[PDB]
Amino acid sequence: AACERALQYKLGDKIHGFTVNQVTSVPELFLTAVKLTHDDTGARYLHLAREDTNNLFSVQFRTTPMDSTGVPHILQHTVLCGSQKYPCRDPFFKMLNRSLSTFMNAFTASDYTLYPFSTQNPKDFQNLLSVYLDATFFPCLRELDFWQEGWRLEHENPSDPQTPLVFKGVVFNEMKGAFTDNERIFSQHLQNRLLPDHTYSVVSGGDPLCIPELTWEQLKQFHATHYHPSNARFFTYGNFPLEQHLKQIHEEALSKFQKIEPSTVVPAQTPWDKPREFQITCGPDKQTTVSVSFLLPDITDTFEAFTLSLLSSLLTSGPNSPFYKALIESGLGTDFSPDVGYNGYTREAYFSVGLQGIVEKDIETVRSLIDRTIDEVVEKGFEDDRIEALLHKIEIQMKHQSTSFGLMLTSYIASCWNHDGDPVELLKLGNQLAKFRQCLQENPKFLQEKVKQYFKNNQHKLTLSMRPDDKYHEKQAQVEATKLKQKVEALSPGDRQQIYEKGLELRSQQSKPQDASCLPALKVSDIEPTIPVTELDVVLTAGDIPVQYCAQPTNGMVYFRAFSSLNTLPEELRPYVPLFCSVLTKLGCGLLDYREQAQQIELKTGGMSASPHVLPDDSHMDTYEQGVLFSSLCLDRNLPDMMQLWSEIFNNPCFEEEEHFKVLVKMTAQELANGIPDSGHLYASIRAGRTLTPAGDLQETFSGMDQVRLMKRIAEMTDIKPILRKLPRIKKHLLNGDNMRCSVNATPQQMPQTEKAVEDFLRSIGRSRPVRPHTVEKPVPVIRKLVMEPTFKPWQMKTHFLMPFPVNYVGECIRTVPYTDPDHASLKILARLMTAKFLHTEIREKGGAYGGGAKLSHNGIFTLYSYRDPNTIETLQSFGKAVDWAKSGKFTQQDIDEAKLSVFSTVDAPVAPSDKGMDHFLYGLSDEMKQAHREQLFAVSHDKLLAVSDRYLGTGKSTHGLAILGPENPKIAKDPSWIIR
Numbered sequence: 011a012a013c014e015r016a017l018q019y020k021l022g023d024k025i026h027g028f029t030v031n032q033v034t035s036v037p038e039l040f041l042t043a044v045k046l047t048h049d050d051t052g053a054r055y056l057h058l059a060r061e062d063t064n065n066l067f068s069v070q071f072r073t074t075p076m077d078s079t080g081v082p083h084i085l086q087h088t089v090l091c092g093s094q095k096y097p098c099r100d101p102f103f104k105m106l107n108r109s110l111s112t113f114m115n116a117f118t119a120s121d122y123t124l125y126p127f128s129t130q131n132p133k134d135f136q137n138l139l140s141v142y143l144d145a146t147f148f149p150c151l152r153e154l155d156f157w158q159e160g161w162r163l164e165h166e167n168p169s170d171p172q173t174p175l176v177f178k179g180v181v182f183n184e185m186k187g188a189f190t191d192n193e194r195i196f197s198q199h200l201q202n203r204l205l206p207d208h209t210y211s212v213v214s215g216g217d218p219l220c221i222p223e224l225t226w227e228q229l230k231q232f233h234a235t236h237y238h239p240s241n242a243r244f245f246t247y248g249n250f251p252l253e254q255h256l257k258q259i260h261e262e263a264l265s266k267f268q269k270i271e272p273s274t275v276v277p278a279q280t281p282w283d284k285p286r287e288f289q290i291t292c293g294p295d296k297q298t299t300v301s302v303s304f305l306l307p308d309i310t311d312t313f314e315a316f317t318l319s320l321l322s323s324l325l326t327s328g329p330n331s332p333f334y335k336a337l338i339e340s341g342l343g344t345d346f347s348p349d350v351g352y353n354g355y356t357r358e359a360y361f362s363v364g365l366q367g368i369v370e371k372d373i374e375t376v377r378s379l380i381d382r383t384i385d386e387v388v389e390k391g392f393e394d395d396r397i398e399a400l401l402h403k404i405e406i407q408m409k410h411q412s413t414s415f416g417l418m419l420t421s422y423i424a425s426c427w428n429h430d431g432d433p434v435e436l437l438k439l440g441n442q443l444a445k446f447r448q449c450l451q452e453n454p455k456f457l458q459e460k461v462k463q464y465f466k467n468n469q470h471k472l473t474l475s476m477r478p479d480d481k482y483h484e485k486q487a488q489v490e491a492t493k494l495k496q497k498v499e500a501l502s503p504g505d506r507q508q509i510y511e512k513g514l515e516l517r518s519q520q521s522k523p524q525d526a527s528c529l530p531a532l533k534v535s536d537i538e539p540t541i542p543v544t545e546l547d548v549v550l551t552a553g554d555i556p557v558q559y560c561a562q563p564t565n566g567m568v569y570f571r572a573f574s575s576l577n578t579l580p581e582e583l584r585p586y587v588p589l590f591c592s593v594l595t596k597l598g599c600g601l602l603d604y605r606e607q608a609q610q611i612e613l614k615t616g617g618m619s620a621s622p623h624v625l626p627d628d629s630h631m632d633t634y635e636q637g638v639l640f641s642s643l644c645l646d647r648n649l650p651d652m653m654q655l656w657s658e659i660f661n662n663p664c665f666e667e668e669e670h671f672k673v674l675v676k677m678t679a680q681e682l683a684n685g686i687p688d689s690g691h692l693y694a695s696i697r698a699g700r701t702l703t704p705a706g707d708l709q710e711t712f713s714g715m716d717q718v719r720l721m722k723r724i725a726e727m728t729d730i731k732p733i734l735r736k737l738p739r740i741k742k743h744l745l746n747g748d749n750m751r752c753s754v755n756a757t758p759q760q761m762p763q764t765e766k767a768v769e770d771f772l773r774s775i776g777r778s779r780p781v782r783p784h785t786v787e788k789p790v791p792v793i794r795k796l797v798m799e800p801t802f803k804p805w806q807m808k809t810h811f812l813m814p815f816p817v818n819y820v821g822e823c824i825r826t827v828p829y830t831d832p833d834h835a836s837l838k839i840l841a842r843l844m845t846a847k848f849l850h851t852e853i854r855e856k857g858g859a860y861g862g863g864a865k866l867s868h869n870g871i872f873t874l875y876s877y878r879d880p881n882t883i884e885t886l887q888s889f890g891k892a893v894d895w896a897k898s899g900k901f902t903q904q905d906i907d908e909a910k911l912s913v914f915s916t917v918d919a920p921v922a923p924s925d926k927g928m929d930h931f932l933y934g935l936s937d938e939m940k941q942a943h944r945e946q947l948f949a950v951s952h953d954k955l956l957a958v959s960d961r962y963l964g965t966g967k968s969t970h971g972l973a974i975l976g977p978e979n980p981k982i983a984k985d986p987s988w989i990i991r
């Protein structure tokens with residue numbers, strides 16, 4: 011075992027230029043931590059040895075911008091554009107298709123940049139390690155790679171210098187879209203105002219109005235100052251041998267450097283003498299946000315950070331928390347303000363609390379309630395059972411097995427490590443918990459004293475309020491048009507000529523097919539021919555309810571799911587099903603009111619939820635399954651309590667709870683509205699697909715813009731009673747055992763108790779004709795009752811949702827073929843091929859959009875999309891040209907092999923013990939069906955790819971749907987084939 015092998019390392023051991031400084035067992039996480047330092051550079055290393063085949067590498071640099079140009083963000087994009095050992099264009103994106111990685115990305119936080127990848131293949135790991143090391147330490151930083159990724163002046167037609175110069179660039183648009191999210195605007199300003207003295211006062215990602223101030227030389231300087239191994243932290247996780255990692259890191263990078271003292275220290279924020287307050291504005295959607303925030307200690311004091319994080323949870327988490335009762339239940343707002351709770355990304359942490367959706371006349375009342383709540387907590391402290399619930403919640407987080415543990419761990423330790431803290435102390439949760447408990451036993455006023463010290467008597471307090479401006483982005487555009495004009499007018503004739511020539515040069519480099527034989531690569535033969543079979547046992551229970559049991563190493567956790575059909579539900583009630591689902595476990599049950607119920611759920615489970623699903627059939631486009639998925643998890647010992655809760659929720663849910671219902675509705679509506687820009691492409695594609703299949707229509711109703719708008723309507727109702735009365739009607743057709751199947755994932759030793767607890771639940775719920783005339787029994791590989799609409803006819807629609815956004819989100823959906831159709835595998839390969847070889851270049855590289863690609867869903871919907879796109883019309887035109895390119899067959903066998911690697915990267919991604927058997931449980935596909943599909947994927951050839959392109963994607967071949975979220979577009983507005991919404 012990897013963790014055992016690492017215990018053999020001794021202090022003082024020398025390995026490939028590193029010295030072992032510490033070896034620590036962390037048995038609660040089944041791992042051994044090895045701390046090392048590189049001898050010559052002083053670079054810090056942490057290896058977490060654990061029996062996990064999904065290994066991760068990351069390198070972290072302390073990056074401290076002193077302006078809002080976004081230099082560390084733009085640098086992060088640019089280092090991935092070519093390096094000394096791999097000078098070809100775009101090593102990172104190319105490696106995405108030459109690898110079987112489980113994760114490959116890069117992130118820029120406020121004061122660090124982090125470069126992680128993960129994979130379960132050891133050769134692949136070495137390959138990706140060499141590319142990442144070369145990119146971060148020896149990057150090309152070519153002027154034109156920057157122009158592409160950062161910002162540039164470019165003629166609207168690069169080969170026509172009489173066309174106007176405009177701003178373009180990937181990060182430029184990425185950040186425009188990031189600050190389309192009004193919570194992100196608030197969150198950025200909060201940090202900037204609370205920590206105004208140093209690096210934390212600026213916009214590290216890039217303020218769009220500041221980006222064009224960035225120069226190429228500034229970009230290179232920032233790299234020279236921050237990207238030295240003395241300024242870095244190296245991290246590996248998993249069961250691959252440490253020695254090979256150290257050998258690569260030393261020989262390919264660190265051996266070329268000597269020790270420096272980096273000029274990258276982030277100094278302490280000097281505490282204020284008196285609180286401050288500020289007001290800002292932000293875009294339209296009466297709706298004022300206000301928060302109060304407090305500066306907290308240095309996160310490098312790990313136990314104090316741990317204590318304050320838990321304290322922040324006690325203060326703000328759930329309907330029983332003091333701030334929830336005082337602020338959310340007050341009905342003064344819709345939801346908590348952004349970044350509520352503990353914020354520990356910055357050298358000094360901070361706590362924040364407040365509300366959004368408040369009428370401006372209520373700001374002072376909110377501020378007063380915040381102060382009154384603090385005084386009350388100081389005086390009365392916290393309920394002991396809530397503290398037990400929190401410690402229980404942490405136990406669940408400790409025991410639950412995830413597939414991305416390495417990524418979670420490096421992200422969790424990053425900020426503390428950034429400021430020379432000790433990441434190993436962060437891993438010792440058992441110690442931290444025990445010390446926290448001992449601190450409660452020894453001082454009964456421990457938490458009260460902490461609240462008094464950090465909240466009541468703390469002068470470093472910020473009140474920030476934000477109010478919408480209906481012309482927010484318009485004013486930004488006007489300022490941008492202004493700055494553009496100033497730059498352009500300043501151009502000498504030589505400058506204009508340089509811009510023209512370099513623009514043409516960049517376009518050429520973006521167009522010319524290039525040799526990539528530089529990069530390492532796996533081969534298709536490195537893909538496993540078959541997959542391990544999933545073992546499950548289906549037992550008919552409580553008569554004829556099928557229950558699926560899947561024994562897994564869940565580490566003492568039980569995962570329960572029940573699926574209940576929607577086939578008997580009157581169709582008029584369908585749009586209210588998502589609302590029903592969101593409040594079902596939150597309104598109280600039986601003798602438990604909503605507060606008692608929340609406490610029991612927090613104390614006894616890791617969560618209990620219901621959600622509506624539409625599950626497409628594997629063989630027929632116009633057949634689907636519809637129902638509600640009930641999902642929960644708990645520790646072994648709490649299983650009977652969990653099922654008792656499910657029994658009460660199914661039998662006696664509190665549908666008379668009108669007050670709390672209104673709170674939940676307004677929270678849900680607020681959250682759905684806030685999340686639109688971040689998921690803009692998803693909303694576009696859901697709309698575009700809604701007229702293509704019966705399932706698609708239902709999905710729009712459940713989770714599309716229609717559902718967002720319905721929730722917003724409901725949240726504005728003066729009398730919510732007519733809605734509330736629909737809930738019992740829904741309960742009647744759903745909360746029973748008439749059309750149900752369940753699943754259980756647990757350890758084989760926990761299985762026997764679980765079968766009994768599950769049987770009792772099923773016997774405890776109600777028992778004893780589909781509203782659709784055509785229902786069909788589809789046996790598995792459990793009879794599922796599906797809806798088929800044999801007279802469904804797809805039709806084309808084009809919808810433009812007018813949004814006050816500075817960028818666009820575009821979706822085009824095309825009806826193709828279901829999973830078991832042999833052409834499905836070809837279309838799946840084609841989606842990645844088109845993304846990698848056409849769409850990424852046209853839409854992102856040339857266009858400047860943050861994202862552009864194609865994908866194929868299980869339902870057979872082929873979707874082309876863009877994300878944070880400055881274009882609309884040109885993007886739709888590129889979709890058409892992508893199809894023309896596919897039909898031309900102008901791609902190589904190597905391009906196809908790379909598309910396969912990419913697809914299999916996704917398809918063969920690790921599945922958590924809790925999620926095993928879910929493919930079978932939900933979609934009813936057996937291992938035999940998946941393996942057949944896998945073989946079809948392996949057999950996809952060049953001739954098949956051009957055939958399916960012509961057969962399904964060509965004009966007039968299949969039905970298409972289109973949707974756009976974005977601002978006014980004159981051309982679309984004048985086209986009567988477009989619906990404006």
Ligand SMILES: [Zn+2]
Nearest residue numbers: 083087181184
């Ligand atoms: Zn970025």
